[PDB]
Design a protein around this ligand. Sequence first.
Ligand SMILES: *[C@@H]1O[C@H](CO)[C@@H](O[C@@H]2O[C@H](CO)[C@@H](O)[C@H](O)[C@H]2NC(C)=O)[C@H](O)[C@H]1NC(C)=O
Ligand SMILES: *[C@@H]1O[C@H](CO)[C@@H](O[C@@H]2O[C@H](CO)[C@@H](O)[C@H](O)[C@H]2NC(C)=O)[C@H](O)[C@H]1NC(C)=O
Ligand SMILES: *[C@@H]1O[C@H](CO)[C@@H](O[C@@H]2O[C@H](CO)[C@@H](O)[C@H](O)[C@H]2NC(C)=O)[C@H](O)[C@H]1NC(C)=O
Ligand SMILES: *[C@@H]1O[C@H](CO)[C@@H](O[C@@H]2O[C@H](CO)[C@@H](O)[C@H](O)[C@H]2NC(C)=O)[C@H](O)[C@H]1NC(C)=O
Ligand SMILES: *[C@@H]1O[C@H](CO)[C@@H](O[C@@H]2O[C@H](CO)[C@@H](O)[C@H](O)[C@H]2NC(C)=O)[C@H](O)[C@H]1NC(C)=O
Ligand SMILES: *[C@@H]1O[C@H](CO)[C@@H](O[C@@H]2O[C@H](CO)[C@@H](O)[C@H](O)[C@H]2NC(C)=O)[C@H](O)[C@H]1NC(C)=O
Ligand SMILES: *[C@@H]1O[C@H](CO)[C@@H](O[C@@H]2O[C@H](CO)[C@@H](O)[C@H](O)[C@H]2NC(C)=O)[C@H](O)[C@H]1NC(C)=O
Ligand SMILES: *[C@@H]1O[C@H](CO)[C@@H](O)[C@H](O)[C@H]1NC(C)=O
Lengths: 170, 133, 35, 197, 49, 50
Amino acid sequence: CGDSTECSNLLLQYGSFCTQLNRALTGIAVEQDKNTQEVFAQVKQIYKTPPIKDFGGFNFSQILPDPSKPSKRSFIEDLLFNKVTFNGLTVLPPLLTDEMIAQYTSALLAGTITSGWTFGAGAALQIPFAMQMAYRFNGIGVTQNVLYENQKLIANQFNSAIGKIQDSLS
Amino acid sequence: QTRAGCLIGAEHVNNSYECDIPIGAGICASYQSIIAYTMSLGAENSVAYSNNSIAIPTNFTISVTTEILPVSMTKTSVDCTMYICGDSTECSNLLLQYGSFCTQLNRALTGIAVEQDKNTQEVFAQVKQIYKT
Amino acid sequence: FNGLTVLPPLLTDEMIAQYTSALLAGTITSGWTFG
Amino acid sequence: STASALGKLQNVVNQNAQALNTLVKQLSSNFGAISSVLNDILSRLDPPEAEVQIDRLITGRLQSLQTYVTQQLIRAAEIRASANLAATKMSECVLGQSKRVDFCGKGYHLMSFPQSAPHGVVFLHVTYVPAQEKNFTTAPAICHDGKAHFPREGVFVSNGTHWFVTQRNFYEPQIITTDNTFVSGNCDVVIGIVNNT
Amino acid sequence: AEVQIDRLITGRLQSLQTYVTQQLIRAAEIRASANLAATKMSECVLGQS
Amino acid sequence: GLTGTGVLTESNKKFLPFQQFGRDIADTTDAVRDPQTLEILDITPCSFGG
Ligand SMILES: *[C@@H]1O[C@H](CO)[C@@H](O[C@@H]2O[C@H](CO)[C@@H](O)[C@H](O)[C@H]2NC(C)=O)[C@H](O)[C@H]1NC(C)=O
Ligand SMILES: *[C@@H]1O[C@H](CO)[C@@H](O[C@@H]2O[C@H](CO)[C@@H](O)[C@H](O)[C@H]2NC(C)=O)[C@H](O)[C@H]1NC(C)=O
Ligand SMILES: *[C@@H]1O[C@H](CO)[C@@H](O[C@@H]2O[C@H](CO)[C@@H](O)[C@H](O)[C@H]2NC(C)=O)[C@H](O)[C@H]1NC(C)=O
Ligand SMILES: *[C@@H]1O[C@H](CO)[C@@H](O[C@@H]2O[C@H](CO)[C@@H](O)[C@H](O)[C@H]2NC(C)=O)[C@H](O)[C@H]1NC(C)=O
Ligand SMILES: *[C@@H]1O[C@H](CO)[C@@H](O[C@@H]2O[C@H](CO)[C@@H](O)[C@H](O)[C@H]2NC(C)=O)[C@H](O)[C@H]1NC(C)=O
Ligand SMILES: *[C@@H]1O[C@H](CO)[C@@H](O[C@@H]2O[C@H](CO)[C@@H](O)[C@H](O)[C@H]2NC(C)=O)[C@H](O)[C@H]1NC(C)=O
Ligand SMILES: *[C@@H]1O[C@H](CO)[C@@H](O[C@@H]2O[C@H](CO)[C@@H](O)[C@H](O)[C@H]2NC(C)=O)[C@H](O)[C@H]1NC(C)=O
Ligand SMILES: *[C@@H]1O[C@H](CO)[C@@H](O)[C@H](O)[C@H]1NC(C)=O
């Protein structure tokens, strides 16, 4: 109608026509919020990484959050964010701001780096990274002796791949 | 004044708890009076990582949890002509010139009912015999 | 009601309870072998 | 004791009831005509104007019924997806033991039990959760007689003075023996190897 | 003028209904994608698949 | 002769010397030129919301 009393009076005789429309739109918004919460909220505590970082030669600096930047994001997250870019209609803001999403990702990543898969069942239990990687090879049919004799080569290949990923994205 | 709009009738605090009634933009309110605050993601801890130290459990517990899943809904049907006309020959004659209008609707409703029955029978009937304790 | 009808489900709840009881007795007594 | 736990089934029932209620309520709309009563229009005017009056009611009711049918179709599709997920859970967590993490239960899965519900199913999941942890010092391999020893299954741990082998998910020390260890190479390339017997 | 007002109103209502239906379909597919993403997060990050 | 509601503020757009009003996209007017003082004013809709 748009500020027209005659239009409103003529329209009033159509019964409940836009109540269900608003119901559906509110349902959609609630579903979006529920989707985000289900996807990201999978931990009970906010884990942190120790100030000293010696993970058997592996290098996670490209993915860990950067304290210098105000957003507390990482290199890859910043690259992803930078790369991609009324008459009665409104846009509502999301319940979870991107800072909290980044915090959830950082907590999950610190937990999986430090405590293996143990933090997904009960309380997080610390473990040296090399032993966790030996467990992961043992879980695919290769003995841990291979990792214990090829640690340096494995770390170098992992660093090279994680370096190439950033260039491929950028 | 919040990123979601303007709020009256509540006090703003500097603490942070679990979110009770979600407001938006990372903030929400609760009752104590009514207080509006910023959400807290959870507890904070720093697991003790060292390169020659581990933690090993010494006891265990057994937990039982619930999960609820809907599998079906009521089967309904609608008679097109009775609903749209209601015992009127003139209405039926006027409506007849619209072609096949409600046969599709009845087809869809019958399909929905058949799908509900199939859903139930597929979800539950997964055994060949009836075992007894 | 003015032309709307509700049809009963094919499986009454007694049969559903019987299915659940059979499944549960089977999984108690025979493990996963009966699957 | 606690109520409001069976939210989903109640929500489905309420949605269906509300849809039916609004559909039956839409029958009392003029839709731009002179009245919502069919006989009153029939017994007040002439057929040339009567049919003009009736056409508006016909088209309005047809539109409302179309909208109701579409909403029912969407809800039926969503319910079908939910039923497929429930069937998969019943197949995988009741008839067997699942290794895929967090599919059914929070922890290490043991078994599940099904129960009926007026329009759905309820799964009771039994899970194992470790507790009462403890700190220990570890080493990846043992150098002895110039040879490197690795554990078959388990991990090396230390009281603080001696060394033992344990299973990964429950503390149970045992003496290091040639039976539960295997040898490969010499203690020269492994980072962190320690001396023992 | 009431006839013209009604003629405008019916078309605007039709457009609104079409937009709502399209939004519903897109929301359904987005929800399916979100469920898949949640399953992947649960199974490939918290454990070994 | 161009009618509409809203609130008018001072703007810094630089109209080329022969236009009377401007629209951004989807055919909605934003800026106008007053016929007397010959300056550019900006229009924003009156505040509303749920
Ligand atoms: C992990 O990789 C990063 C590269 O992303 C390393 O950071 C570089 O370090 C060298 C030597 O100090 C500098 O010359 C580069 O400018 C650094 N690059 C960036 C982007 O800061 C980092 O040193 C590596 N980690 C370790 C422990 O060496
Ligand atoms: C394991 O050893 C640590 C170090 O001696 C114990 O102390 C914890 O150390 C971390 C990091 O150094 C701190 O963040 C904790 O606050 C410390 N805990 C306490 C109670 O002081 C730790 O308690 C030991 N046990 C466990 C299960 O970690
Ligand atoms: C493992 O945990 C269980 C559960 O707490 C312990 O059993 C308890 O033991 C105390 C002391 O003997 C009793 O007072 C409780 O009644 C027991 N609980 C139950 C449910 O029976 C058990 O002792 C723990 N095991 C170890 C080795 O500490
Ligand atoms: C290292 O483990 C050993 C084995 O459990 C512990 O030594 C025992 O201690 C008890 C109590 O003092 C003695 O009765 C046993 O004779 C010891 N065993 C042996 C083989 O000597 C020892 O306590 C552990 N180390 C520490 C620091 O607790
Ligand atoms: C685990 O960490 C410790 C401490 O950071 C490392 O110990 C260092 O070892 C080098 C070479 O043997 C010494 O020069 C340093 O003085 C040691 N550090 C300290 C604080 O004494 C150890 O190398 C790391 N790796 C293991 C144990 O495999
Ligand atoms: C484990 O034992 C071996 C031999 O008993 C140690 O190797 C000796 O190390 C010293 C100091 O570096 C040398 O002077 C000897 O020549 C080495 N002997 C041999 C046969 O290689 C080894 O250092 C011990 N491990 C640790 C961690 O101390
Ligand atoms: C319309 O007439 C008014 C009335 O004179 C004009 O306004 C004057 O414009 C001159 C031009 O610089 C100013 O010096 C005066 O101060 C203005 N008088 C006022 C505002 O009272 C206006 O310019 C005319 N517009 C035209 C000719 O387009
Ligand atoms: C606490 O809250 C008040 C208002 O709620 C605010 O003015 C103040 O900056 C906050 N922080 C401190 C440290 O007082």
